[PDB]
Amino acid sequence: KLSLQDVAELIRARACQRVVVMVGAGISTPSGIPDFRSPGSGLYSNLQQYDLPYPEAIFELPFFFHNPKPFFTLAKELYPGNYKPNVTHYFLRLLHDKGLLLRLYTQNIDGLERVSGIPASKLVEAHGTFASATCTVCQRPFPGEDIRADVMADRVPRCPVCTGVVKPDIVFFGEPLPQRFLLHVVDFPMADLLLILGTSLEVEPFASLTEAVRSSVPRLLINRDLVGPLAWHPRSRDVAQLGDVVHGVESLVELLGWTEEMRDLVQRETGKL
Ligand SMILES: Nc1ncnc2c1ncn2[C@@H]1O[C@H](COP(=O)(O)OP(=O)(O)OC[C@H]2O[C@H](O)[C@H](O)[C@@H]2O)[C@@H](O)[C@H]1O
Ligand SMILES: NC(=O)[C@H]1CCCc2c1[nH]c1ccc(Cl)cc21
Numbered sequence: 001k002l003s004l005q006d007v008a009e010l011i012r013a014r015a016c017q018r019v020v021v022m023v024g025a026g027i028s029t030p031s032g033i034p035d036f037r038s039p040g041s042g043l044y045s046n047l048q049q050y051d052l053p054y055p056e057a058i059f060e061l062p063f064f065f066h067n068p069k070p071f072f073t074l075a076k077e078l079y080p081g082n083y084k085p086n087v088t089h090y091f092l093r094l095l096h097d098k099g100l101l102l103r104l105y106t107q108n109i110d111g112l113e114r115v116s117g118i119p120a121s122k123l124v125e126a127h128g129t130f131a132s133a134t135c136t137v138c139q140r141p142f143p144g145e146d147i148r149a150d151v152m153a154d155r156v157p158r159c160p161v162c163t164g165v166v167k168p169d170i171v172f173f174g175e176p177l178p179q180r181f182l183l184h185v186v187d188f189p190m191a192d193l194l195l196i197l198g199t200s201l202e203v204e205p206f207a208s209l210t211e212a213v214r215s216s217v218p219r220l221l222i223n224r225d226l227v228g229p230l231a232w233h234p235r236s237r238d239v240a241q242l243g244d245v246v247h248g249v250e251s252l253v254e255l256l257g258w259t260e261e262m263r264d265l266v267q268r269e270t271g272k273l
């Protein structure tokens with residue numbers, strides 16, 4: 001059984017040099033964005049004011065087509081621009097500056113990976129992005145910034161060509177994943193370390209990606225709980241660092257001897273922000 005120290009030593013040695021990283025909503029709870037499924041604070045448990053047929057409806061296309069207002073009220077609360085990356089996002093950024101990041105796959109739409117300074121070429125926004133938007137009727141694309149003012153002013157954005165409702169290019173639940181996600185079949189066989197942070201690993205095909213790396217590759221989970229294939233299909237090189245994601249990342253960072261360089265980077269990026 002590998003320890004968190006063994007993993008850090010592998011990384012220090014550059015024995016793991018092509019790190020694939022998978023993240024979900026749990027990496028942004030420290031930034032003030034709720035996840036979905038946490039008791040008490042998760043988005044699922046706080047949607048009564050929207051009077052939905054069931055919680056998941058607010059992120060579903062058929063419901064959106066019936067009544068887009070609940071989605072847009074929520075999106076205004078979640079819209080990028082003032083939330084900041086936290087230590088989790090900066091740790092990933094530091095992996096990238098150290099040339100260790102092969103690819104970062106995120107289920108999040110908050111854009112915080114890009115903000116923390118990871119290049120677009122290193123990211124797969126598997127659930128899309130507010131950076132672009134599409135008419136749901138005529139399919140006309142728009143710059144995501146085109147709908148910002150309406151969303152902030154509590155207006156549903158409308159297509160100036162056909163008047164159809166414009167939606168950010170977010171992947172609503174059970175909608176087709178973006179063409180960029182097709183890189184998973186190139187990246188996962190090349191990974192020599194898989195790091196999984198802040199995701200329940202409930203939602204497919206994303207969760208089965210943990211199984212797509214080589215059996216010899218360590219899979220390090222940094223999360224509140226042991227989840228998904230790491231609970232139900234453990235492999236002998238799995239490591240679990242269970243607890244708050246920021247403390248878990250800081251523990252790894254210290255074992256890496258990167259504490260000072262992180263402190264340095266976070267201070268620098270905060271200033272730029
Ligand atoms: N501060 C924290 N520290 C450690 N773990 C945390 C923290 N906060 C949350 N967690 C864990 O973080 C995990 C968050 O799990 P989920 O809420 O399902 O979010 P997702 O991103 O995996 O999947 C949501 C996909 O499902 C929807 O369809 C959308 O498409 C989403 O993209 C839980 O294990 C929490 O214990
Ligand atoms: N932090 C996040 O970006 C998370 C939590 C905020 C809402 C959200 C996230 N992921 C999503 C993926 C699809 C859709 Cl429709 C919504 C979300």
Ligand SMILES: [Zn+2]
Binds near residue numbers: 137138
């Ligand atoms: Zn249109």
